[PDB]
Design an enzyme around this catalytic site. Structure first.
Site, PDB file in Angstrom:
ATOM      1  CG  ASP A 137      -2.163   0.891   1.106  1.00 45.77           C
ATOM      2  OD1 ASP A 137      -2.618   1.238  -0.012  1.00 45.77           O
ATOM      3  OD2 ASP A 137      -2.679   1.326   2.182  1.00 45.77           O
ATOM      4  CE  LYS A 139      -2.975   4.704   0.299  1.00 46.55           C
ATOM      5  NZ  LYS A 139      -4.135   3.878   0.048  1.00 46.55           N
ATOM      6  CG  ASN A 142      -0.342   4.469   3.574  1.00 47.09           C
ATOM      7  OD1 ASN A 142      -1.068   4.854   4.519  1.00 47.09           O
ATOM      8  ND2 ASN A 142      -0.744   3.560   2.681  1.00 47.09           N
ATOM      9  CG  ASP A 159      -1.947   1.853   7.617  1.00 44.60           C
ATOM     10  OD1 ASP A 159      -2.408   1.953   8.790  1.00 44.60           O
ATOM     11  OD2 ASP A 159      -2.391   1.043   6.731  1.00 44.60           O
ATOM     12  CB  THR A 178      -4.868   3.874  -3.903  1.00 39.55           C
ATOM     13  OG1 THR A 178      -5.366   4.067  -2.568  1.00 39.55           O
ATOM     14  CG2 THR A 178      -5.164   5.112  -4.722  1.00 39.55           C
TER      15      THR A 178
HETATM   16  O1  LIG Z   1      -4.677   8.310   8.311  1.00 44.11           O
HETATM   17  C1  LIG Z   1      -4.299   7.206   8.595  1.00 44.11           C
HETATM   18  C2  LIG Z   1      -3.000   7.012   9.383  1.00 44.11           C
HETATM   19  C3  LIG Z   1      -2.459   8.085   9.968  1.00 44.11           C
HETATM   20  C4  LIG Z   1      -1.268   8.361  10.908  1.00 44.11           C
HETATM   21  C5  LIG Z   1      -0.792   9.614  11.230  1.00 44.11           C
HETATM   22  C6  LIG Z   1       0.257   9.713  12.117  1.00 44.11           C
HETATM   23  C7  LIG Z   1       0.782   8.538  12.701  1.00 44.11           C
HETATM   24  O2  LIG Z   1       1.829   8.652  13.608  1.00 44.11           O
HETATM   25  C8  LIG Z   1       0.282   7.294  12.395  1.00 44.11           C
HETATM   26  C9  LIG Z   1      -0.743   7.194  11.472  1.00 44.11           C
HETATM   27  C10 LIG Z   1      -5.070   5.915   8.226  1.00 44.11           C
HETATM   28  C11 LIG Z   1      -4.492   4.666   8.487  1.00 44.11           C
HETATM   29  C12 LIG Z   1      -5.161   3.482   8.139  1.00 44.11           C
HETATM   30  C13 LIG Z   1      -6.425   3.536   7.536  1.00 44.11           C
HETATM   31  O3  LIG Z   1      -7.107   2.345   7.196  1.00 44.11           O
HETATM   32  C14 LIG Z   1      -7.012   4.773   7.272  1.00 44.11           C
HETATM   33  C15 LIG Z   1      -6.337   5.961   7.612  1.00 44.11           C
HETATM   34  O4  LIG Z   1      -6.933   7.206   7.346  1.00 44.11           O
END
Ligand SMILES: O=C(/C=C/c1ccc(O)cc1)c1ccc(O)cc1O
Length: 275
Positions: A137, A139, A142, A159, A178
């Site tokens: 994933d 992109k 992430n 993520d 995506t």
């Molecule tokens: O937005 C996401 C992750 C953000 C993030 C920001 C700061 C961090 O330290 C860790 C993760 C996100 C992750 C998984 C998902 O299925 C849908 C999402 O919208």
């Protein structure tokens, strides 16, 4: 595998929301006993076996098992896991400088700016692939920055919801990633391995250098059809001052046959990247 079943609110306070998806929401949080700050990812559980809502326990356990194994500057570190009847809550390292995607919209990058980001992505993927972990994933959404206010921001892959261990060289599962970023073998429902991440890196590099997405159509079906046919080109209007070696790096990643695509080791030795 069971997780901590005390109420997460007894141990953490939550704040600003960081991100939001179909079955997850991520909130900044603070651990009461230490003052340290994290990102709490709340993943909605499936409420019945046959349901399409929520994330299956198998999928949640896999993401947790992968996060437990990784420790590297360019990947998020897992701190704790809690659960209750409705959610699994991952307490993750806080990465608060925003997306590569949003920081991108602020300005295309120079080749040096792009390679400074890209080398960190390649180092993180080299670590993952060395452990036989495909991310599946990759992109801009992430990839996030630790501090967006420095000339050379540090990044983390943030993520791991589609990541799999590839102990047999390939896995045969469908990856609903995506469309703009998935490799042809994902589009065509073929066996998948580490090579799919190298295609995604090719797409990311094309966008970093140009501001434009190489396969994006007007609908998701057009994007997927373009990916499978390798229907992209370097538009002169966007690439006229981009070096031919940067184009060569991309061209060797946006290759339909996964066996002919550069691997992560190849990418680090390519002349555009190698010191
Ligand atoms: O937005 C996401 C992750 C953000 C993030 C920001 C700061 C961090 O330290 C860790 C993760 C996100 C992750 C998984 C998902 O299925 C849908 C999402 O919208």
């Amino acid at each position: 595998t069971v997780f901590r079943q005390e109420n997460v609110d007894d141990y953490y306070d939550t704040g600003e929301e960081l991100g939001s998806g179909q079955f997850a929401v991520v909130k900044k949080c603070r651990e009461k006993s230490t003052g340290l700050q994290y990102a709490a990812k709340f993943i909605k559980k499936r409420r019945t076996k046959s349901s399409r809502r929520g994330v299956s326990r198998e999928d949640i356990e896999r993401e947790v098992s992968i996060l437990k194994e990784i420790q590297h500057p360019n990947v998020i570190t897992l701190h704790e896991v809690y659960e209750n009847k409705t959610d699994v809550i991952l307490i993750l390292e806080l990465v608060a400088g925003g997306e590569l995607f949003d920081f991108l919209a602020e300005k295309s990058l120079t080749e040096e700016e792009a390679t400074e980001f890209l080398k960190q992505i390649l180092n993180g993927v080299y670590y993952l692939h060395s452990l036989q972990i495909a991310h599946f994933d990759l992109k801009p959404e992430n990839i996030m920055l630790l501090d967006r206010n420095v000339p050379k921001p540090r990044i983390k892959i943030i993520d791991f919801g589609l990541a799999h261990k590839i102990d047999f060289g390939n896995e045969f599962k469908n990856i609903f990633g995506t469309p703009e970023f998935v490799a042809p073998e994902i589009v065509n429902y073929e066996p998948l391995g580490l090579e799919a991440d190298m295609w995604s890196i090719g797409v990311i590099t094309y966008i970093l250098l140009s501001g434009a997405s190489p396969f994006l159509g007007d609908t998701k079906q057009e994007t997927l059809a373009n990916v499978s046919a390798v229907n992209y080109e370097f538009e002169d209007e966007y690439f006229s001052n981009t070096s031919a070696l940067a184009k060569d790096f991309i061209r060797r990643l946006l290759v339909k046959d996964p066996k002919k695509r550069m691997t992560i080791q190849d990418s680090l030795q390519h002349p555009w990247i190698k010191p």
